[PDB]
């Protein structure tokens, strides 16, 4: 039987474009540029899959005749975004799709559905959490992941689950981001840790309640997949089999100095002084006497300094950073102020949202640990 359906343009366009956004820019084989449309009494399903990430959305539609068809995905996305804002009729007549909408008509070739991989089945549901928290937490941690697929152990977000408590962690060897949260667990005996490709997870986050599917009980992570579901949408990503670094060793228990600053004021000041930094390599932070002297540059191109008021206590120090990595950490706090914990100018700096020492580390739900650069 040949698929024939009708549905509202905007509904059609939103569903196709969400599936098509994930399609490979460099398709390993041509058939992976397609999206699959499947019509049943249970509605219209639009899906895509490239052997690593799958995406699937069900939308209400008037199905005049059930069936399945594969067509060029980004082409279908661009068409549905540009059609007149009228109901869209879509009829497959064998090897050819007739698409009509208002005063417009398209005739599109079909692709070889028999060659398209089958979408993986989701593991059992593991837990749920609000979309807002999912998006915030992943955004805070993904910023620290490695971006080099030749070092897969760094390209993941580690996800540790213990009952109702989740810990997310990512590192690229220069910063480490760790976020703790509470979620709604759906299974009891969950004591597991998986590693999820960060880019994929980050994109799933930037798109109502979210359900994570990794399996149940002792089976969590055993199927090598994470399913993410919500709002008639459902995606899967293959887990990484790489081993995550021992990040808890890095978290300092005590600080020789602690400081707090206004996040926006500090961010703007780093952007200003780094204008004279060679290749934006480093900005220097001189802490003492309730004052932060932020500086950069050299005599060849120019020197800059801005002094901003801070709370400071402990051993004064000058410590230098990659200004992009520092802005990245500040932007991830989502708080008005930042609290710093330091040991020495050669050792990691702890950033978290906000007599003379040493200062015990303060419990928090988010840390961004940033290695300095050498002066």
């Amino acid at each position: 039987t040949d698929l024939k359906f009708r549905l509202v343009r905007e509904s059609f366009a939103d569903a196709v474009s969400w599936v098509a956004k994930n399609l490979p820019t460099r398709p390993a084989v041509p058939v992976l540029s397609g999206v699959l449309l499947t019509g049943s009494d249970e509605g219209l399903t639009i899906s895509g899959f490239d052997y690593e990430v799958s995406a699937e959305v069900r939308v209400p539609a008037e199905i005049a005749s059930p069936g399945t068809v594969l067509v060029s995905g980004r082409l279908l996305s661009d068409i549905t975004r540009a059609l007149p804002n009228k109901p869209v009729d879509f009829y497959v007549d064998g090897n050819r799709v007739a698409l009509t909408c208002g005063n417009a008509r398209f005739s599109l070739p079909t692709m070889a559905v028999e060659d398209y991989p089958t979408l993986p089945t989701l593991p059992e549901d593991t837990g749920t959490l609000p979309a807002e928290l999912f998006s915030e937490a992943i955004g805070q941690v993904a910023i620290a992941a490695g971006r080099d697929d030749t070092l897969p152990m760094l390209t993941g977000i580690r996800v540790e689950i213990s009952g109702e408590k989740v810990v997310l962690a990512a590192t690229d060897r220069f910063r480490l981001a760790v976020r703790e949260l509470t979620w709604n667990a759906l299974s009891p005996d969950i004591e597991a840790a998986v590693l999820v490709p960060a880019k994929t997870l980050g994109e799933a986050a930037k798109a109502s309640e979210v359900r994570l599917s990794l399996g149940a009980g002792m089976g969590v992570g055993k199927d090598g997949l994470l399913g993410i579901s919500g709002d008639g949408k459902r995606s899967t990503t293959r887990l990484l089999d790489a081993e995550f670094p021992k990040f808890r060793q890095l978290l300092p228990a005590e600080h020789t100095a602690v400081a707090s600053a206004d996040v926006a004021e500090l961010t703007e000041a780093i952007k200003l002084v780094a204008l004279v930094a060679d290749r934006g390599a480093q900005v220097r932070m001189e802490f003492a006497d309730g004052m932060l002297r932020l500086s950069a540059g050299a005599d060849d191109v120019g020197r800059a300094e801005e002094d901003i008021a801070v709370e400071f206590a402990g051993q004064p120090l000058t410590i230098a950073f990659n200004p992009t990595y520092l802005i990245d950490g500040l932007a991830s706090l989502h708080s008005e102020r930042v609290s710093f914990g330091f040991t020495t100018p050669g050792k990691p700096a702890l950033l978290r949202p906000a007599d003379q020492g040493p200062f015990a580390a303060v419990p928090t739900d988010y840390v961004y640990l940033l290695m300095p650069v050498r002066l």
Binding site: T171, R173, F174, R175, L176, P245, K246, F247, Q249, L250, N322, G346, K347, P348, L369, M371, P372, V373, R374
Partner: peptide, 10 residues
């Protein structure tokens, strides 16, 4: 540009 004292890792 030293790395975090990850062992192994750096």
């Amino acid at each position: 540009v030293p790395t975090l004292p990850l062992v192994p890792x750096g």
